Amino acid sequence: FQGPTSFHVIQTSSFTNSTWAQTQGSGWLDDLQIHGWDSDSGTAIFLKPWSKGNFSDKEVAELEEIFRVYIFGFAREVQDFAGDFQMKYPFEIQGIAGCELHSGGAIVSFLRGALGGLDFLSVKNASCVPSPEGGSRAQKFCALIIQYQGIMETVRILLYETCPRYLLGVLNAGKADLQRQVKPEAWLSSGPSPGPGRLQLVCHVSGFYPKPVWVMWMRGEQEQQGTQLGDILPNANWTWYLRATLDVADGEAAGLSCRVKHSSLEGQDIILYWRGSGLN
């Protein structure tokens, strides 16, 4: 099937000083947000009608309570122990946890934590593993949390028992949006390129869903290996935008075309033709 294959929740916890911290969180299917965390209320914001997947309201509420309790206690413990391993304010902690469906059907779970934007720890085999960037501080931290009752057991349950069945339920409940097909549009632009007698041609491709796409500058049926893909950029409302560029000598630009292949097109590729001399 098409569309996202993973669910994850993220945490950004910003510690301004000894007494002030604030946590942002959200839930995601690959890059598509399906949950928000509302710090006004300590509850989740459900962004799609199907964002609860096949979970009952009782179970959703229970998970919300777990997160609400975690978010509050995390800040409490981090502060109490910020004196223990010397940590200078301000600092920021990040966390990502979830699971992913792989080819063959297997579901793999993951949890990673970061401090100041560098890896700090991960959970592997239901055990806390310090990352080498986290230093001795990450070692002391892992040895601490494993002693606090219930934490690792709750983490184990969520990672390996709750997340896999949530992912399967929500991938199915949301399939009409998740596996929809949205045709891109494409257009050409130009502009100066570094060096004498060089031009940069740009094939813009916008509005496609799902994310996998193929864009190539061509000469007839010969793909131009010099094609450079830019990073895929988001549009609002769950579609994407991509620039494919080609550096070409002046006077060798004629004969170039841009071909777009996409799952939504039903084999009707988009082909754009570069014309010279300001004939667009």
């Binding site: 993220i10 920021e92 100041g116 934007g117 549009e185 950029l233 935008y241």
Partner: protein, 100 residues
Amino acid sequence: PKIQRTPKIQVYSRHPAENGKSNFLNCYVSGFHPSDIEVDLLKNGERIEKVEHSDLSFSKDWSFYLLYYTEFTPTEKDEYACRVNHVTLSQPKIVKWDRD
């Protein structure tokens, strides 16, 4: 934790720019750290009021990213921009939209 990351700022329209035709102006701000950041979309150097944005997310390398956007009708003379302020930036950085 010591090293801060200045934002990358990319401004682009949802559709090819055509004068008179409603469009969407996107500003993608990425690669930055820490997460505190201020982002405005400008019309002729004035802050646009009706601007939406994504909730905070981050890359595999822990760098933050945000998408800000508004509807807009491009014209011949109107100028649009994205203005970012961040602890790595001394003054706010203004990246102009260029339909090319």
